[PDB]
Amino acid sequence: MYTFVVRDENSSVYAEVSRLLLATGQWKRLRKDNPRFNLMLGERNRLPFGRLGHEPGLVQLVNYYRGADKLCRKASLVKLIKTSPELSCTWFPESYVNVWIKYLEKPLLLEPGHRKFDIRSWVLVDHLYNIYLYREGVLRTPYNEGNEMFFEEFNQYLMDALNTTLENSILLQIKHIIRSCLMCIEPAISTKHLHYQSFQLFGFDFMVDEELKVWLIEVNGAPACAQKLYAELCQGIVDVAISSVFPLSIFIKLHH
Amino acid sequence: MRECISIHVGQAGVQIGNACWELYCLEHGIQPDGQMPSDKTIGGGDDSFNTFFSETGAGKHVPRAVFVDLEPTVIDEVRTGTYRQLFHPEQLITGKEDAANNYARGHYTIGKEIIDLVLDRIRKLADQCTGLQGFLVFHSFGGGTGSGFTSLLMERLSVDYGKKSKLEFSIYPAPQVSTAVVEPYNSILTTHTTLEHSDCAFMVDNEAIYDICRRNLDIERPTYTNLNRLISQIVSSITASLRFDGALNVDLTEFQTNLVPYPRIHFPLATYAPVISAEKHEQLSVAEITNACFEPANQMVKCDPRHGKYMACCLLYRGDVVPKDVNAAIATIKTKRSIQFVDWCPTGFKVGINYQPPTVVPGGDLAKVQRAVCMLSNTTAIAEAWARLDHKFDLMYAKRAFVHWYVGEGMEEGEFSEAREDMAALEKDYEEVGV
Amino acid sequence: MREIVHIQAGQCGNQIGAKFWEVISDEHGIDPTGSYHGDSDLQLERINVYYNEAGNKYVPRAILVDLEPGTMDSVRSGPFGQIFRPDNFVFGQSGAGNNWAKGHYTEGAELVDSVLDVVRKESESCDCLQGFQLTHSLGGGTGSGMGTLLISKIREEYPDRIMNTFSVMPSPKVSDTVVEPYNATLSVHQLVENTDETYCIDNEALYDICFRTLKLTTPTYGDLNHLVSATMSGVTTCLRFPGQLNADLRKLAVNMVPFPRLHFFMPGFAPLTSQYRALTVPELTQQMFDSKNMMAACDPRHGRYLTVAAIFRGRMSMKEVDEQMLNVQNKNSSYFVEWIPNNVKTAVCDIPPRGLKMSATFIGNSTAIQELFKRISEQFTAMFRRKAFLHWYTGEGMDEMEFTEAESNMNDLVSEYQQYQDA
Amino acid sequence: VIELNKCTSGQSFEVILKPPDPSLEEIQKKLEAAEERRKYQEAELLKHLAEKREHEREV
Numbered sequence A: 001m002y003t004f005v006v007r008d009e010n011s012s013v014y015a016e017v018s019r020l021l022l023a024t025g026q027w028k029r030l031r032k033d034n035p036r037f038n039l040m041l042g043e044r045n046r047l048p049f050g051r052l053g054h055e056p057g058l059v060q061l062v063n064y065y066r067g068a069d070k071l072c073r074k075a076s077l078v079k080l081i082k083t084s085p086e087l088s089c090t091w092f093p094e095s096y097v098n099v100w101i102k103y104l105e106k107p108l109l110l111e112p113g114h115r116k117f118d119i120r121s122w123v124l125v126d127h128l129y130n131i132y133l134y135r136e137g138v139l140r141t142p143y144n145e146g147n148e149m150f151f152e153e154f155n156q157y158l159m160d161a162l163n164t165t166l167e168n169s170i171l172l173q174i175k176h177i178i179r180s181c182l183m184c185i186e187p188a189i190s191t192k193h194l195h196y197q198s199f200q201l202f203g204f205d206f207m208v209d210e211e212l213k214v215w216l217i218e219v220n221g222a223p224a225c226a227q228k229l230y231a232e233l234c235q236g237i238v239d240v241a242i243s244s245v246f247p248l249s250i251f252i253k254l255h256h
Numbered sequence B: 001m002r003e004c005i006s007i008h009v010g011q012a013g014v015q016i017g018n019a020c021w022e023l024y025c026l027e028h029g030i031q032p033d034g035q036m037p038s039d040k041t042i043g044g045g046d047d048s049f050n051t052f053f054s055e056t057g058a059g060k061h062v063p064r065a066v067f068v069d070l071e072p073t074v075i076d077e078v079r080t081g082t083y084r085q086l087f088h089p090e091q092l093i094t095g096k097e098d099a100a101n102n103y104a105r106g107h108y109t110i111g112k113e114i115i116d117l118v119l120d121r122i123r124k125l126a127d128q129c130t131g132l133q134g135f136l137v138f139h140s141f142g143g144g145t146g147s148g149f150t151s152l153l154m155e156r157l158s159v160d161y162g163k164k165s166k167l168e169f170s171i172y173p174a175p176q177v178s179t180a181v182v183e184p185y186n187s188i189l190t191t192h193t194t195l196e197h198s199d200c201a202f203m204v205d206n207e208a209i210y211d212i213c214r215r216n217l218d219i220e221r222p223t224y225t226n227l228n229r230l231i232s233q234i235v236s237s238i239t240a241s242l243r244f245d246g247a248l249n250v251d252l253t254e255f256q257t258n259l260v261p262y263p264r265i266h267f268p269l270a271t272y273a274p275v276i277s278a279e280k281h282e283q284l285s286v287a288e289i290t291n292a293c294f295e296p297a298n299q300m301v302k303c304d305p306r307h308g309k310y311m312a313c314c315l316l317y318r319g320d321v322v323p324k325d326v327n328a329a330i331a332t333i334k335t336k337r338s339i340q341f342v343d344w345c346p347t348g349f350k351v352g353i354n355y356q357p358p359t360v361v362p363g364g365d366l367a368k369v370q371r372a373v374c375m376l377s378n379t380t381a382i383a384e385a386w387a388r389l390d391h392k393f394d395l396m397y398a399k400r401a402f403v404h405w406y407v408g409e410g411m412e413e414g415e416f417s418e419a420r421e422d423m424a425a426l427e428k429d430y431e432e433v434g435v
Numbered sequence C: 001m002r003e004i005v006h007i008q009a010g011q012c013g014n015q016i017g018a019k020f021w022e023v024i025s026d027e028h029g030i031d032p033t034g035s036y037h038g039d040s041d042l043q044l045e046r047i048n049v050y051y052n053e054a055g056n057k058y059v060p061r062a063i064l065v066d067l068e069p070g071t072m073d074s075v076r077s078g079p080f081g082q083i084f085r086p087d088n089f090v091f092g093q094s095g096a097g098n099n100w101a102k103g104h105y106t107e108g109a110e111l112v113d114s115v116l117d118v119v120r121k122e123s124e125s126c127d128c129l130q131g132f133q134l135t136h137s138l139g140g141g142t143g144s145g146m147g148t149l150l151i152s153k154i155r156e157e158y159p160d161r162i163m164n165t166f167s168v169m170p171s172p173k174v175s176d177t178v179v180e181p182y183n184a185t186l187s188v189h190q191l192v193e194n195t196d197e198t199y200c201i202d203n204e205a206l207y208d209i210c211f212r213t214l215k216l217t218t219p220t221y222g223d224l225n226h227l228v229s230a231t232m233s234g235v236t237t238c239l240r241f242p243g244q245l246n247a248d249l250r251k252l253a254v255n256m257v258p259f260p261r262l263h264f265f266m267p268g269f270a271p272l273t274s275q276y277r278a279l280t281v282p283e284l285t286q287q288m289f290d291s292k293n294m295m296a297a298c299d300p301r302h303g304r305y306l307t308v309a310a311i312f313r314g315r316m317s318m319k320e321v322d323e324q325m326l327n328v329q330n331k332n333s334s335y336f337v338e339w340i341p342n343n344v345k346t347a348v349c350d351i352p353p354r355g356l357k358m359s360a361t362f363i364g365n366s367t368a369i370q371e372l373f374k375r376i377s378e379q380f381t382a383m384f385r386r387k388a389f390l391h392w393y394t395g396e397g398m399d400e401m402e403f404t405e406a407e408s409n410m411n412d413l414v415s416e417y418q419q420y421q422d423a
Numbered sequence D: 001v002i003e004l005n006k007c008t009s010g011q012s013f014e015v016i017l018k019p020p021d022p023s024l025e026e027i028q029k030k031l032e033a034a035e036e037r038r039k040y041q042e043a044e045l046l047k048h049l050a051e052k053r054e055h056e057r058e059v
């Protein structure tokens, strides 16, 4: 039987997966500081990565990639893009550590309403560093249900308003950003030869201007999910990232 | 020529010492008899191998070594081993009651009774040195003698040989083979008391050695013999520069100046490649073995240098290796891996090549390889080993578990805390070097 | 540290002691005449731990003590009667009448100087004395009262040696007299102060294993001692054969005893014997940890393990043993305290006991041992609340105050165990 | 490649990719302090054991 611990009760996403793991009859939750665990759903800050992978006879997995914060926090994201020849960059606003926040002057506006929006995409990277983008993104909607439009309605809108589909006008760019960012740091964080394994759920923030060009704004390492999308995504984390190493589609695979 | 005296302490130190001098003998063409048909200067000489071997008028090459253990079972296997006639009786010192995996028993109770003798026996080897460089001390962290008596010895060697360097080869405790539950206690205690007396210490985690034996050599349940033969190769790579002609790490002082800029942070991480089973093989290239030096799976201490910072890096090759292939390998690795140095140090590598390919003992489990490399890098990632150890220490000491065994031997409960805060001070020093 | 001085005192102590020597003598290849007749050399590499050398004959370092000559006369004519050293038979004639006071203060005090005289000659010819091993019951008079008196005197002369006991705790299920709780409570306090390691052999458990697991309608003391000798052989394997773990008495104490007074161990054995089908390694590890295999009538799931020592005997895969031992820990880690990391230590010996191809011996320092002292305490209080049967003890000079002290000292021991079970 | 040295047994060099105690009496003191604590603890035990002999005679 598989065993796991929980060290972040504030995580809404992983408070769910903790529920389903207990709901399969093959996962037994231990207390916070029991080291004889197979899976750690660890704390956000100061995760003891150096104490994992040292339990004889236990394959250990954790839901965070050591070193991923160089991508998540803006200050480190800026220096990563300009100092990496893999990025150098057409899809990232000008940043440093004539309207600035560079605040994109003319964003695409949802009509009717003259409304501003930003797209949140959920990406799951497993222990083998397969990049999985959740098929169900969300849209977080003047400009001078619950401000959340899901991908179906936004797709129908662009087909009616500007005679294009979401896949062609935005989603191809989105998939390119996710791949470029995540494979830029693969040699620095991957656990393919480590004594413990790592997966992690990511939340990318994207922008769209009136020319239907996609910009990367922020990537979050501890993101929350939309209410309706909580069930399907969390269960997908079990199938793809947890059960794949501890055996008991909703993702697009950005191949390589 | 300047001499080096080896000191082997406890079961781990003694058994590892045996595997090392057995390997040294095969590499220098010294037979168990002690003779050396290649050595044409009988009765003496100042060759590079004389740093570790002295010579008798009868042509016998005896080690500048002393084996001490507080129980005789292990050192008696040296008195009767295949290299028994190599050692002189006064080199092998044994008690009859060991430290019972108790640091206090090794340092205070029983160490006091024998510390004077071993120093005189060491003084005997020192007196026949024209210019002794210092000492190599082999011991375990978890054993009562290895931990408790070494710290006492390291203190006395500093007051008697103040101008002389001391290098450690320390076995870090792993539960897959550990002998005791209190090994975290003994490890923290001996590190605290020895830290200021050690110029540079090569730490070996039995867990890492154990898993390399399982993966690369395919032994289902490795034994100490398996572990010590692998460890012996690594030791032989570090000390080869003192026993063979060369220009890199030629004296013990050079180890400190090359690998240890900050005195307290004197624990270089060692990575060895390649390790291939003798029951098998395609020979690996200079680039492939150099690239393997940056795989956590080949390190003596499992940790991730990608998330630390380098203060120094040294590449020691043995076999068919030319400088051209080393550069072409480093150029490739530096662009395809995360090698970040501290701001106050140059990003570079001190390279040493010995043309003699690595020697493997007949009947062993290591395939003779045509070229190998041991990397010595001072990275802050090795502090992960202190973190694991300090945590285990905190768990038991919070409830004062087993503390009575140490207090019952004359040690005070305060030494526990003062040693722990020294590791907390060692742990913070690492933090603010690889920020 | 090599030599162990063995002492067996009282009826139970000498009966159990006689079987122990009968068993390990067979394992080391020693016949009743003291001559070795074995095929392997592992039998002789550590035989000096329990045997002295004579015509190249091995004689146990054993001291046989009792206030009655009856039990020690049957040993002298037992199967291995002639092997023991004649002078090491130290016996009186009055007996102890199942009276702790007689064994500790009157009858036994008259005899114990003779025992110490034999202890001294056995020890002074030791190259490196490990310590002492006592076998006795706590429910009688000689083994309980004179046994603990003997332990107190030995500690005075050898304060820096290990004191190890195999104690037989009484049970109403197999009871000789009603005063057994009195004698057991007085003895436990002595053991708390003056021993380093005590294997708690509960007659309640031994009986239950015979009647339930082995399905014997009416177990005898021989049936009970069959389990004890098998346990004693198991827990001393590390002492009698080459190995790196718990190979002597002080290293065992350091690994097993995190606090000086919590040194009472719960032994287990698998398989249960009274046999050609050998057990798998998983079957051995599942049984050696099962409650039905413990020799102390305590449910381990009612408490928590402080330390565990597991010994596997036979030709088996040391890998598979490691997997299964690392397996049991990770599946029931809730029953292992979090503040002692890696508190389970495993050993494997190539030589199995007689009749078995594979066996497993369990030594646990569990806080569930508290249940046993509580059992003795309630039986004690039930009588002591009415001062029943106390005249047998006050007639030997004891005062009621000594009983109340023993009562509360054991209640303290129970409280100490409950303290670390909730930690 | 900096500082290249060659001999018959091999060669060594350096590449650069980017520029940037207690005395003897104090020891013997603490060892004798630990010894007197051992002797003191043992004395208190033998004193405790001497009291139980007194009680044995009184009984």
Ligand SMILES: Nc1nc2c(ncn2[C@@H]2O[C@H](COP(=O)(O)OP(=O)(O)OP(=O)(O)O)[C@@H](O)[C@H]2O)c(=O)[nH]1
Binding pocket: B009, B010, B011, B012, B013, B015, B016, B069, B070, B098, B099, B100, B101, B102, B106, B140, B141, B142, B143, B144, B145, B146, B147, B171, B172, B173, B174, B177, B178, B179, B180, B183, B206, B224, B225, B227, B228, B231
């Ligand atoms: N690699 C390796 N480790 C060993 C060897 N022998 C013992 N160890 C390790 O050393 C630790 C125990 O210390 P020991 O050296 O055996 O004990 P000691 O130094 O003799 O001290 P005492 O016996 O207590 O007096 C454990 O963690 C063992 O795993 C060995 O031959 N090779």
Ligand SMILES: Nc1ncnc2c1ncn2[C@@H]1O[C@H](COP(=O)(O)OP(=O)(O)CP(=O)(O)O)[C@@H](O)[C@H]1O
Binding pocket: A093, A101, A102, A103, A104, A116, A117, A118, A140, A205, A217, A218, A220
């Ligand atoms: N360069 C830019 N141009 C226009 N708007 C921007 C912008 N950068 C950030 N924003 C605005 O800020 C919002 C997101 O804020 P931002 O991602 O920078 O920090 P944050 O972490 O607080 C949001 P979250 O909680 O989702 O991670 C977007 O909806 C977007 O409207």
Ligand SMILES: Nc1nc2c(ncn2[C@@H]2O[C@H](COP(=O)(O)OP(=O)(O)O)[C@@H](O)[C@H]2O)c(=O)[nH]1
Binding pocket: C009, C010, C011, C012, C013, C015, C016, C096, C097, C098, C137, C138, C139, C140, C141, C142, C143, C144, C168, C169, C170, C171, C174, C175, C176, C180, C203, C206, C221, C222, C224, C225, C228
């Ligand atoms: N296991 C076992 N217990 C015994 C044996 N003989 C007596 N006992 C137990 O020991 C207690 C009686 O003590 P006993 O040894 O006969 O008295 P003593 O001779 O004065 O020490 C009772 O609780 C008995 O159940 C025996 O052969 N085996």
Ligand SMILES: [Ca+2]
Binding pocket: B039, B040, B041, B042, B043, B044, B045, B046, B055
């Ligand atoms: Ca010469």
Ligand SMILES: [Ca+2]
Binding pocket: C110
């Ligand atoms: Ca009389």
Ligand SMILES: [Mg+2]
Binding pocket: B010, B011, B071, B098, B143, B145
């Ligand atoms: Mg030892």
Ligand SMILES: [Mg+2]
Binding pocket: C011, C140, C176
């Ligand atoms: Mg009787």
Ligand SMILES: [Mg+2]
Binding pocket: C113, C117
């Ligand atoms: Mg007398």
